[PDB]
Write a protein that binds this DNA or RNA. Structure first.
Lengths: 108, 108, 205, 49, 95, 78, 149
RNA sequence: GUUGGGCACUCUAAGGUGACUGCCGGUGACAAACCGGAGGAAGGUGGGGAUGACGUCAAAUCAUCAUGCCCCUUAUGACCUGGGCUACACACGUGCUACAAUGGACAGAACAAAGGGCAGCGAAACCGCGAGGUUAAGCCAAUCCCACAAAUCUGUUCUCAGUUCGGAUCGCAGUCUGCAACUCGACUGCGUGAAGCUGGAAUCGCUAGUAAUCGCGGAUCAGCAUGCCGCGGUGAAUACGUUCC
RNA sequence: AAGAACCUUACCAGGUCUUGACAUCCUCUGACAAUCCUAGAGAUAGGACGUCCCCUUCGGGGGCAGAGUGACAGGUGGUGCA
């Protein structure tokens, strides 16, 4: 368990960290580099020491509920100014200048 | 030495046969390095095999243009056309395999 | 519709009017040319000029204006010419020259022919007649074909519809055939009417 | 005569029409084609390709 | 002396070089005979869209034909004779 | 660009800097929907043209860094 | 009006078999003949490592069992709807041999294509699997409606 | 080639040559043809483009343009600023990118053609995670710069998972361009991680360097490409036959 | 008409001018003008500052500009069964 997330055992560490909300490939890569540990080792084949080090590096990053809240307070902020983007957030329409007529289904 | 210009597509191979041991050296590399495919190498040797001059001559090609397949066909065509300068008796055996025809299949 | 015969026969059997190389001056030297030829038209609207060939040489711009009325073109002692030059000299910016040759047999050149018919239709000469004068004049000139057309409200006739009196052959099939072509618009008191005039003038062998 | 440089747009320098203009000649597709035919455009002949 | 000729008609461009070479050879300087340089092919494609996606193509083309004329062991009379020669309206004489 | 810094029309920034001399007081009408909201604007009501009418937008803290036109939606749709 | 000549393919350089080349060209996708030249040479090393026989002994045996003898052709003269038993021309035998070999090899469960193609050849050679079945299927069907022709 | 080195070869591009039933066998009116055979790069209509006749829809265009008769003519002319053209319950058309392993990620070699560049291309050097910025080499040019390829191939890892598949979308970083990127730019960091496990009926097109697939350049152009137009790289399957249409 | 941020742009909202944006003149003939100051959202302004056209037998004219001037000019406003 890392940052309160049960990362999978069978897959490699880099992959298992991508599941951790707030960690992608390149974050997982520079975590394990900063941990001074092989990035080819497996989670099932790691050490509790190595886990500790990985866990210490990840504590410096904003991940999971910490990050989810940061993102959510932005949704607040935009609906708290009635900004174009705010209104696009609450309406469920594209917020960055994408057309609606067709090809907007992710939002709609 | 016996010279013969080959052309396929945009490739243009300046073939030169010299008395040797069946080494094809294209732009100062072994043919295997320059042309990876075995199928292409066999087809490049096809004029030397039919005249039974494989192991008689060292082929010194200077190629420029097109790709790896293309470069092949021009070498093949240029070996064939070099052999004709080596021995006019080969014309009959080459011509039967269609090696003396220039493949003028351009893009549409 | 059809390809402009001249369009597809330039640099082939006919030549450039605008004989000049120019790299970075292209547009300057070009739009100049456009004034020069548009000026000599508005000026010499009645002098039977067509092939206003324009050559160039840094600041020595030559204008050959081939004219069927060359005695009329020069003027009383080069009066028309000199006045033409000074305007062009003050417009273009260069030493505008005035070499002049003749359009012998105006009925060989299709611009002049189509210009002749342009006036007849303004002065209300029956479409019928207008062309036939040209046709027969062009035949005697020595032309292997002609195809005058006039199209529009013909005679003030409410319904516009086209009238073409065609003699000889119009071999558009032959890239080496010298098909001249020239269009013109005939503004009467019922709109405008289209003078289109083809002239095959012997093969270019 | 536009205010800023960006606003300044290429217009057909013969037509005046502000569309389709060829930077080499400063002509719209129309004014060019016509003049190309007549053959007043120093070395620009119709092609077959 | 190095001369570069550029034209839209290769005929007048050849007739030019002939004289440029002949005037230099009567002048007595050795000539590098007119090098044909890679002819420039500017193509202009005016499309008139029909049914939107089909589009009647009309292609125009300008060819600048080029010739390079080196004059070796140049002479006073050559340098003169080059300026004396009148290369036509459709040739650009660069020295 | 982002090295040049945030954008604001000098015609507007002058109007609001005159109000910063006094205490807010007046309400500025402008057509500079493109002007960034600076900290100096905080507390003001800015009348911003939405294409037909001027929308009165009160300038709070979270509105700093955005443009004025973010708060004056130009297109009507329900 | 006169039967167009089929394109003369080169022999496969290592097995000297224009059949094996034709397989490569059948396997080739998006003009990636490299990928298919690799896959086959990988598949034939798999066949030779398992069986011990030459891949050519097995592959020719595989084709024998896939290659059709009689095929159904639709004939609708007046009514008819006759599935005319037609003898497969020797070129169309190899065609349908290689087509089915490749088509069913791609559909197999094995992870890599080199293994999938190897296993379909090994199954075809043992007179079993799906590609052999497909030949049987059309022959069973051709035998079923054999009263036409 | 970097330099010396005629220049050979490749190329560049002006002019010539070459292909025909010319030739040799059959076959057949001894002719024509047909069927083969030579020689040639080319086999029997060399291959791509371009170039047609008379016609029709009082077809479409008075928004390319011009234009009789009208109409407006302190306005139906004109000027600016902001906005809209970019809305979206949805549909009709066009295309891109995936729906993984004949891959993804990851490293190591590669091998093009064409076109553009002075108000421009910008070398390299230099900094940044990169997009970019730095200062600027050489060059209106077969000489310098943009380009100097991607597929592929050699590795090399994951293991058939909605995944190292897929990247939508959204949140946060910046970079250029322009007066200005809020509505309304492109691009890059970082995080996020949608649908899709390759779509029926139906329907359209295509006999070879074609289908397919991969990059590149250009036009328009301050910036803006999943379009258009070039350009090359790799490269298929099949045509049995006149059965039905 | 996949090179619409402004421009383009023709539309809308709001401001704004009326030989009018532009246009032959009819003339008078000035410089035209940058300009940078004050507003403005800008246009439209008002204005600091800034006006020598040259040739001229030295008149006038080619002008360009304003004002006048005169019909108009200009219309992407109708009619493609003119």
């Amino acid at each position: 368990r890392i940052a309160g997330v049960d990362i999978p055992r069978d897959k490699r560490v880099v992959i298992s960290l991508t599941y951790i909300f707030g960690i992608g490939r390149t974050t997982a890569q520079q975590v394990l580099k900063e941990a001074g540990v092989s990035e080819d080792t497996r989670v099932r084949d790691l050490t509790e020491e190595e886990l500790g080090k990985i866990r210490d590096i990840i504590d410096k990053l904003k991940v999971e509920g910490d990050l989810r809240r940061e993102v959510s307070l932005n949704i607040k902020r935009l609906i708290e100014i009635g900004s174009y983007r705010g209104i696009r957030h609450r309406r469920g329409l594209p917020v960055r200048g994408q057309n609606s007529k067709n090809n907007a289904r992710t939002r709609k | 030495q016996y010279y013969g210009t080959g052309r396929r597509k945009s490739s243009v191979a300046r073939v030169r046969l010299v008395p040797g041991e069946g080494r094809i050296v294209v732009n100062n590399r072994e043919i295997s390095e320059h042309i990876p495919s075995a199928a292409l190498i066999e087809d490049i040797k096809q004029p030397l095999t039919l005249t039974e001059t494989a192991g008689t001559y060292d082929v010194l090609v200077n190629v420029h243009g097109g790709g790896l397949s293309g470069q092949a066909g021009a070498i093949r065509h240029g070996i064939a056309r070099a052999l004709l300068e080596a021995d006019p008796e080969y014309r009959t055996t080459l011509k039967r395999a269609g090696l003396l025809t220039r493949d003028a299949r351009m893009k549409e | 519709q059809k390809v402009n015969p001249v369009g597809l026969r330039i640099g082939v059997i006919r030549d450039w009017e605008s004989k000049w190389y120019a790299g970075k001056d292209y547009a300057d030297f070009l739009h100049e040319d456009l004034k020069i030829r548009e000026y000599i038209s508005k000026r010499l609207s009645d002098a039977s000029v067509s092939k206003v060939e324009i050559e160039r040489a840094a600041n020595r711009v030559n204008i050959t204006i081939h004219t069927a009325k060359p005695g009329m073109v020069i003027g009383k002692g080069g009066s028309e010419v000199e006045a033409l030059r000074k305007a062009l000299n003050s417009l273009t910016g260069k030493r505008v020259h005035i070499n002049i040759l003749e359009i012998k047999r105006a009925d060989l050149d299709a611009q002049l022919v189509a210009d002749n018919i342009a006036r007849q239709l303004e002065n209300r000469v029956s479409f019928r007649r207008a062309q036939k004068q040209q046709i027969q004049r062009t035949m005697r000139a020595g032309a292997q074909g002609v195809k005058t057309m006039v199209s529009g409200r013909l005679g003030g006739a409410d319904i516009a519809r086209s009238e073409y009196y065609s003699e000889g052959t119009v071999p558009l099939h032959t890239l080496r055939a010298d098909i001249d072509y020239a269009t013109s618009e005939a503004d009467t008191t019922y709109g405008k009417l289209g003078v289109k005039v083809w002239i095959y003038r012997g093969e270019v062998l | 005569t536009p205010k800023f440089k960006v606003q300044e747009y290429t217009r057909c320098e013969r037509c005046g029409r502000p569309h389709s203009v060829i930077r080499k000649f400063k002509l719209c597709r129309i004014c060019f084609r016509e003049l190309a035919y007549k053959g007043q455009i120093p070395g620009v002949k119709k092609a077959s390709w | 002396i190095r001369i570069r000729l550029k034209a839209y008609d290769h005929r007048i461009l050849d007739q030019s070089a002939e004289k440029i070479v002949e005037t230099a050879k009567r002048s007595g300087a050795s000539v590098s005979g007119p090098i044909p340089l890679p002819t420039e092919k500017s193509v202009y494609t005016i499309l008139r869209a029909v049914h939107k996606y089909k589009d009647s193509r009309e292609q125009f083309e300008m060819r600048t034909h080029k010739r390079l004329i080196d004059i070796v062991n140049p002479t006073p009379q050559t340098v003169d004779a080059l300026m004396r020669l009148d290369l036509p309206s459709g040739v650009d004489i660069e020295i | 660009s982002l090295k040049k810094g945030p954008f604001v029309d000098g015609h507007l920034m002058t109007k609001i800097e005159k109000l910063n001399e006094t205490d807010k007081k007046q309400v500025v009408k402008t057509w500079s929907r493109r002007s960034t909201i600076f900290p100096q604007f905080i507390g003001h009501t800015i009348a911003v043209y939405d294409g037909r009418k001027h929308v009165p937008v009160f300038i709070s803290e979270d509105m700093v860094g955005h443009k004025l036109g973010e708060f004056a939606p130009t297109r009507t749709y329900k | 009006k006169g039967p167009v000549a089929k394109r003369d393919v080169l022999p496969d350089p290592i097995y000297n078999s224009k059949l094996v080349s034709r397989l490569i060209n059948k396997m080739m996708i998006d003009g990636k003949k490299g990928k298919s030249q690799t896959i086959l040479y990988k598949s034939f090393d798999i066949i030779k490592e398992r069986t011990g026989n030459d891949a050519m002994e097995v592959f020719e045996q595989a084709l024998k069992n896939i290659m059709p003898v009689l095929e159904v052709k639709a004939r609708r003269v007046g009514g008819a709807n006759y599935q005319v038993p037609v003898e497969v021309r020797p070129e169309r035998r190899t065609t349908l041999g290689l087509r089915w070999l490749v088509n069913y090899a791609r559909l197999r469960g094995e992870k890599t294509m080199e293994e999938r193609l190897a296993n379909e050849i090994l199954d075809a050679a043992n007179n079993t699997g799906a590609a052999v079945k497909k030949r049987e299927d059309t022959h069973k069907m051709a035998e079923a409606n054999k009263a036409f022709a």
